[model samples]
Target: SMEQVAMELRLTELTRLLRSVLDQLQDKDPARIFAQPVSLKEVPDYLDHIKHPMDFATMRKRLEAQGYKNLHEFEEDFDLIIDNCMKYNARDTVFYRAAVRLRDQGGVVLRQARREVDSIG
Candidate 1:
């Protein structure tokens, strides 16, 4: 039960902090400060395209081409991006694309995902 106890304590502390911040800000509506959180069903499948300095597809292909032994590492990195988007209530095209890419390509085997790094040279 130690883990549960610790989690409870952490949550309590976070609540205290949030309360303090709210008091300091003196905002009448807490909802105004935070975005309306999206449900899983609310998240869009396809995001509009943007002229990104670095293309997400290109980066994914490059990373795949590196041929890393561990797929978990790639998964973890992608999950981090997804977590950030969820945490910050980001619903932009970039965030959507990142989530979509992870969902679509995260399942490939490390060796199979890796391909033709020769083009980079």
Candidate 2:
């Protein structure tokens, strides 16, 4: 009763599912746009418009540090990556298309994770 084992099991299970989404996203992105932090030197005015900027490398660190308490926290950051890029680049640009694919694939991975989580009975 003192040391509840439920949280221990739940967190690990959630983290593993979270990690799998990141893994699939990374594999899908060969261009490495989401691979690391966006360079201000390159984008110049990226931060001017975007309030929440995130990247893949940082997500890994959060996972290592257990920064996410649950799936929604993890999903929020994941979705931000896509939203930021789409907001920055126009629909005609390659960057926008990249974000599009990531969102598509990301939705798939996230949906599948939810399915597995639900199937546990």
Candidate 3:
């Protein structure tokens, strides 16, 4: 048995699911809040709270670079995007609302897909 074949097979579907989940997340954020990272000059205090900033732009790059290993790392960064938004904004009355929205809707899909990916072992 070729272990590489197994890993490769997992890789293909993992990436496909990951991409699909990310697309869902983006559509959930209709306001385009998490499309790109926040600027420090606007929210100088943002850096003070959200130490690990995340955005779809950065996530896309990481996915393209294949920087995420074993796929869990991809969701780790994905969660970071969700976490950083909720914690920082507190409730832009908008940003945090969408954050929770994504968590409940898109986040659930990602979790389910991730379970399938990991169980492929």
lDDT of 1 by residue, 43-69 (tens): 443233211122223324434354322
Report the number of the highest-lDDT candidate: 2
Could you give me the TM-score of model 2 versus the true structure?
0.87
- For each candidate in the order shown, give its overall lDDT on alpha carbons: 0.38, 0.84, 0.80
Clashes of each: 0, 0, 0
> TM-scores, in order shown?
0.26, 0.87, 0.80
Highest TM-score model number: 2
Q: lDDT tens string, model 3, 1-121?
A: 7998987767766676677777877888888988998988888888778889999999988776656666678878878988888887767578889888888887578777767776864
